[PDB]
Write a protein that binds this ligand. Structure first.
Ligand SMILES: Nc1ncnc2c1ncn2[C@@H]1O[C@H](COP(=O)(O)OP(=O)(O)NP(=O)(O)O)[C@@H](O)[C@H]1O
Ligand SMILES: Nc1ncnc2c1ncn2[C@@H]1O[C@H](COP(=O)(O)OP(=O)(O)NP(=O)(O)O)[C@@H](O)[C@H]1O
Ligand SMILES: Nc1ncnc2c1ncn2[C@@H]1O[C@H](COP(=O)(O)OP(=O)(O)NP(=O)(O)O)[C@@H](O)[C@H]1O
Ligand SMILES: [Mg+2]
Ligand SMILES: [Mg+2]
Ligand SMILES: [Mg+2]
Ligand SMILES: [Zn+2]
Lengths: 632, 358, 164
DNA sequence: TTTTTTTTT
């Protein structure tokens, strides 16, 4: 009740590679992309083929469904047949020519095959892992193969399985043995030993018949110019939050990664994985052997919806309106968040570095959608972390020393601001954090480093992150009788590190309350924003694409803007002296002005800063200043 | 397993009949807890808590909250803990705790290295009852603010970074600041909690033990009538080791009928699964009424304000309208639902000054 | 990350903890036994470096070698430069060039760089009296104290930076 | 054994 006629299966597989096609976009002909990739391997511009099983399933070929089911049910065997058919295709393409020598193993094989000269002999003398030097991987997209970590059980051993999850731990790349080669002392023969699993045992005595009969007692010595190594990496992957049952905690699983799929992940990423579930060589331990990995953080091509925007221009108002369209109003606050999503340029004049990114602090009365805005920003940004004031320690924000109980070792563990490096950290309930936890971010917000000297550890870590924070005023509500410093109960050293500080009030008004009620009740009716003016708005995906495009530019400042910027700084610094209800102003302010001007130039996708951008930065700073004195 | 619903077509027929009757919401609210005299508006609120609102998940992944949260503050010996224990019996997936002996870490989630679930994580898609809520510390109270709104617990400490789902409804009971309600100070002064915490409760009830000879006589007569009762098929020396109720002397309510608790459990189980939608008359009524509630001024009527009023109370109006529409087995929310929701909220919002001050 | 470097022969004990170096060597890989009792090996290999040369020369810092190699001509240029009456200002303002004013603080940092006379017992190799200079900066926010610390940290060969 | 660190009571 088993099928072992491999030649017929090879015929089916080769017919798939010959006959799958996609029509050309101009209608000029047909592309046969799998055999194009085979020829790329033959000319050594490539190292792996990724095959989609659903293309086999939906191909217009006899026995296609049966081939797809057989691949899925015994994937560990069909990899060999795919490698054999691709090797035969490579030899049919190549003919009497030779593939180029690129590495020492290629040089050894090409030299030794013609030393042997000077197919039965080839296949008996050399193992197929050494004769074939490329990789084959499978993928699926149909929802029949979607599972959690929790559901992979005894029925799934040997089958192809697909899942989705979060990466907890990842090792560095290591060399892993695939084929060992030994040579005899006395008789100069060679032994080839392929390795499977996580162990191997080396042979001791020479097996060659002349050496054995002569009893020459020749030892075997291993050689690493002929031996084959491969990139190896290990991961631990956790369940996603939507997959977990009610009132339960997520589970984890170990994943082994080989070859070209290594270095595609680091800690703090969300991935889609396809692989084969296997035991370790009567109760057994198990792991997942990864076949294909995709970062959902990451995934010259442009979408047509983006092409329309890039041709249109003047996009600033639409981009401001497209941030969380369920939330009514707060246009200037959305513009401030839009600038914080992009930021300015890093400067490194004469060895002295200056921070390029922008920091924003939001405050307001209860029930004014601060948490909703922070949640939308966390979804919109590529790499971002979310924390609350109560749920975080000053060691969970920065970095921790971990004492391993198994070994006794000490190691470092990066916190939220380390994981968010190159991106955005959102801190909710910022006023309820302890002072001795809050003072950890002083180095990060200005020098963008974390430096540690504890136990037997002394290092520095990079933390190049923007911080967006939300809080309530000092007694839960703004008090118009108390000063700005009494309403905002933060020290001046911390206050100077924020480029923008905003206040959002809730005040009763008989028309605005009705308009807000109409908007919220429409959202509850239909599940989407009203759009009563029928104006265009941008999808979340293409807004993410546009912001990613904006980050590539580095616009330079015109030297003509000097007098405007400096005069604005002096005029700003006069009021803090001569006011009854002043605020703190320091030399960081003028750098904040330059940052916001360059940020709007990036949003415009221009390469030179304009005085219009300088004026818009000044307008936003004036709005932020006026927010802190309502009804005065 | 030793540690729940059951149905037959006769039971389905009776559910159809009671749903087609004249005032099913009032019948269920009266039938909820008969051996406690009074507290009719709070019983309506507890029925709305047991039914619950509708969660909305929008096209961009944004979420809007569905659960309902209720607070009771009042004088001692006014049956706050008794009503908490009754809701603990009626609701499936329910947990009870006290603020006296709960840390915020144990109430949400703990590091033990491993991550350990707390009570509000364990009660996901369920009910938490908290007694002696005024005895909790503010350091523990500030840990709840994320859970009561976003339905999440987030932790970032040494070696652990994780989200946890904690979507549940909070029912809480407390005593006022001075241990007994002071009539010469305002209700907000007597409650003594900050606006950011008070805004997260859909309904707040202040319960007072007023000396008044009529009410004292009625309450004492009800209590003694419940204490002199014995089952019809029982001998006098014994010791504990259909749709309508039949013996009702213990219940005090003289003539009006009461539903059996098993029928209550079955009816609530079926009515929970109804998924009503909103309509234009409901939308117009809600939008006008919200502006009227915010703009009303209390110096006219010698009343005083019991709650903050924010944008969350508009969502409370929407939630209560859907919860009332569920009890009718209706597929649509109408003005008939929204008027009852407004009357309940307006009862909660305002209170006349106590007789000691008048 | 961290890496193991193996020194053989005359390279042994040629470097201290705290030094910053460049290493040239051979990259190697070795197997490990599953049990120390038995012949079986793990199929994932351990890696290290066999050293061939250590270099510590770096021109971006004040040099690390007691100044043995300076030519007579540059010694005479130094002696000629020392006769300016401006010598304090000329040396002080060249340190931390991107920082505006704070000339008194710059002169203090110049005194920190030079130090006093060493006073040691050579029989016991112990300091009789301290010759190093300690400095505290205390002031308002946004006045470049951390930037001056960064300049002094980058200038010297043996330096450490800690915070909070 | 004794020592050092981070969460909890
Ligand atoms: N202008 C608005 N538009 C839409 N929804 C709003 C608006 N204002 C408040 N809300 C709603 O109010 C609820 C509370 O939002 P939330 O983000 O928690 O407010 P908040 O500013 O965080 N209050 P707090 O966290 O206690 O300081 C959500 O359901 C929002 O949808
Ligand atoms: N109609 C009634 N109204 C009020 N109390 C009643 C009534 N009927 C019985 N009681 C009794 O009054 C007590 C109810 O108070 P209980 O629920 O035990 O504590 P509490 O109300 O939470 N007060 P406290 O815990 O001190 O804040 C019980 O002894 C009940 O048996
Ligand atoms: N006189 C100055 N010369 C050069 N840069 C300056 C000067 N004054 C301020 N700055 C800039 O303003 C910022 C000062 O930051 P910083 O170095 O932390 O000062 P600080 O004294 O450490 N303030 P703080 O650490 O918060 O107490 C940097 O961006 C400097 O480049
Ligand atoms: Mg909030
Ligand atoms: Mg009680
Ligand atoms: Mg500083
Ligand atoms: Zn031999």
């Amino acid at each position: 009740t088993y099928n072992t006629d491999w030649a017929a299966e090879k015929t089916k597989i080769r017919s798939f590679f010959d006959e799958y096609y996609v029509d050309n976009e101009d209608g000029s002909g047909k592309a046969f992309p799998y055999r194009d990739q085979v020829f790329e391997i033959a000319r050594r511009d490539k190292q792996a083929i990724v095959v989609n099983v659903d293309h086999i399933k939906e191909s217009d070929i006899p026995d296609a469904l049966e081939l797809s089911e057989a691949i899925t049910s015994n994937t560990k065997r069909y990899e060999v047949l795919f490698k054999d058919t691709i090797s035969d295709m490579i030899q049919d393409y190549l003919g009497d020519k030779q593939a180029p020598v690129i590495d020492a193993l290629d040089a050894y094989m090409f030299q030794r095959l013609h030393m042997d000269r000077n197919l039965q002999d080839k296949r008996k003398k050399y193992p197929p892992q050494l004769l074939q030097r490329f990789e084959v991987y499978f993928t699926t997209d149909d929802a029949a193969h979607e599972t959690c970590v929790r559901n992979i059980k005894a029925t799934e051993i040997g089958h192809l399985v697909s899942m989705k999850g979060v990466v907890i731990r990842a090792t560095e790349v290591k060399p892993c043995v695939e084929v060992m080669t030994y040579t005899c002392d006395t008789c100069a023969a060679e032994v080839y030993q392929p390795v499977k699993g996580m162990q191997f045992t080396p042979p001791v005595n020479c097996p060659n018949k002349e050496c054995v009969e002569a009893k020459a007692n020749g030892r075997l010595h291993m050689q690493l110019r002929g031996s084959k190594f491969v990139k190896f990496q290990e991961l631990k992957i956790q369940e996603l939050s939507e997959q977990v049952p009610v009132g339960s905690i997520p589970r984890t699983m170990t994943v082994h990664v080989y070859g070209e799929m290594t270095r595609k992940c680091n800690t703090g990423n969300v991935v889609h994985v396809s692989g084969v579930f296997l035991p370790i060589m009567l109760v057994a331990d198990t792991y997942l052997e990864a076949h294909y990995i995709n970062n959902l953080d990451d995934n010259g091509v442009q979408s047509a919806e983006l092409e329309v925007l890039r041709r249109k221009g003047d996009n600033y108002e639409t981009l401001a309106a497209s941030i969380a369209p369920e939330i009514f109003g707060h246009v200037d606050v959305k513009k401030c968040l839009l600038m914080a999503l992009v930021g300015g340029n890093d400067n490194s004049s004469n060895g002295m570095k200056i921070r390029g990114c922008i920091n924003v602090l939001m405050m307001g009365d209860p029930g004014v959608a601060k948490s909703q805005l922070l949640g939308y920003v966390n979804r919109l940004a590529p790499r971002s972390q979310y924390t609350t004031g109560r749920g975080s320690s000053g060691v969970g924000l920065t970095a921790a020393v971990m004492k391993d109980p198994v070994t006794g070792e000490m190691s470092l563990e990066g916190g939220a601001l380390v994981l968010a490096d190159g991106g955005i950290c959102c801190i909710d309930e910022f006023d309820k954090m302890m002072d001795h936890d809050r003072t950890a971010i002083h180095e990060v917000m200005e020098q963008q480093t974390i430096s540690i000297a504890k136990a037997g550890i002394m290092t520095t870590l990079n933390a190049r992150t923007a911080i967006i924070a939300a809080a309530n005023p000092a007694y839960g509500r703004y008090n118009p009788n108390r000063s700005i410093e009494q309403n905002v109960d933060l020290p001046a050293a911390l206050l100077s590190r924020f480029d923008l500080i905003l206040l959002m009030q809730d005040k009763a008004d008989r028309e605005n309350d009705k308009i807000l009620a109409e908007h919220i009740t429409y959202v509850h009716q239909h599940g989407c924003h009203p759009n009563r003016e029928k104006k265009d708005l941008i999808s979340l995906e293409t807004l993410r694409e546009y912001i990613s495009l904006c980050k590539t530019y580095t616009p330079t400042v015109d030297p003509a803007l000097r007098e405007r910027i400096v005069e604005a700084y002096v005029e700003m610094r006069r009021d803090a002296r001569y006011s009854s209800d002043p605020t703190f102003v320091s030399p960081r302010m003028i750098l904040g002005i330059v940052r916001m001007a360059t940020a709007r130039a990036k949003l415009r996708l221009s390469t030179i800063v304009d005085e219009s951008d300088v004026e818009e930065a000044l307008r936003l700073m004036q709005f932020a200043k006026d927010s802190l004195r309502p009804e005065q | 397993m030793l540690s729940i619903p059951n149905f037959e077509p006769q039971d389905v027929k009776d559910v159809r009949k009671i749903s087609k009757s004249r005032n099913p919401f009032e019948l269920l609210a009266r039938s909820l807890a008969p051996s406690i005299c009074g507290h009719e508006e709070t019983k309506k609120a507890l029925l709305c808590l047991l039914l619950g609102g509708m969660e909305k998940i929008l096209n961009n992944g944004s979420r809007l909250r569905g659960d309902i949260n209720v607070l009771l503050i009042g004088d001692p010996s006014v049956a706050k803990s008794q009503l908490l224990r009754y809701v603990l019996r009626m609701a499936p997936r329910a947990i009870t705790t006290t603020g006296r002996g709960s840390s915020g870490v144990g109430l949400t989630a703990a590091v033990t290295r491993r991550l350990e679930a707390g009570a509000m994580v364990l009660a996901d898609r369920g009910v938490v009852c908290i007694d002696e809520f005024d005895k909790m510390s503010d350091i523990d109270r500030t840990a709840i603010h994320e859970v009561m709104e976003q339905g999440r617990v987030t932790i970032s400490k040494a070696g652990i970074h994780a989200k946890l789902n904690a979507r549940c409804s909070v029912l809480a009971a407390a005593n006022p600041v001075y241990g007994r309600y002071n009539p010469f100070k305002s209700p907000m002064e007597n409650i003594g909690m900050q606006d950011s915490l008070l805004s997260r409760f859909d309904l707040i009830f202040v319960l007072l033990d007023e000396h008044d000879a009529d009410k004292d006589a009625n309450v004492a007569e009800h209590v003694l009538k419940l204490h002199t009762y014995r089952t019809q098929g029982e001998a006098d020396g014994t010791v504990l080791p259909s749709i309508y109720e039949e013996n009702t002397q213990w219940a005090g309510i003289q003539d009006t009928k009461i539903l059996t608790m098993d029928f209550m459990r079955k009816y609530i189980h079926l009515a929970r699964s109804v998924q009503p939608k909103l309509t234009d008359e409901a939308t117009e009524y809600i939008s006008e009424v919200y502006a009227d509630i915010r703009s009303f001024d209390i110096t006219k009527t010698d009343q005083e304000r019991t709650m903050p009023v924010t944008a969350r109370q508009l969502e409370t109006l929407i939630r209560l309208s859907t919860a009332i529409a569920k009890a009718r087995f209706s597929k649509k929310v109408e003005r008939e639902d929204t008027e009852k929701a407004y009357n309940l909220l307006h009862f909660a919002c305002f209170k006349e000054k106590p007789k000691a001050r008048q | 990350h961290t890496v193991s470097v193996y020194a053989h022969g005359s390279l042994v004990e040629s470097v201290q903890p705290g030094d910053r170096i460049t290493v040239t060597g051979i990259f190697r890989a070795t197997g490990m036994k599953v049990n120390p009792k038995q012949r079986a090996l793990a199929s994932v290999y351990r890696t290290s470096i066999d050293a061939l040369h250590f270099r510590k020369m770096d021109t971006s810092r004040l040099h690390q070698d007691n100044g043995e190699t300076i030519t007579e001509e540059r010694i005479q240029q130094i002696i000629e430069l020392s006769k300016r009456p401006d010598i304090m200002d000329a040396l002080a303002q060249s340190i931390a060039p991107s920082i505006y004013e704070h000339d008194d603080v710059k002169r203090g940092l110049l005194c920190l760089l030079f130090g006093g006379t060493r006073k040691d017992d050579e029989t016991t190799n112990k300091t009789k009296l301290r010759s190093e200079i300690n400095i505290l900066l205390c002031g308002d926010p946004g006045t470049s104290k951390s930037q001056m610390l960064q300049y002094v940290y980058r200038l010297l060969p043996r330096s450490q930076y800690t915070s909070g």
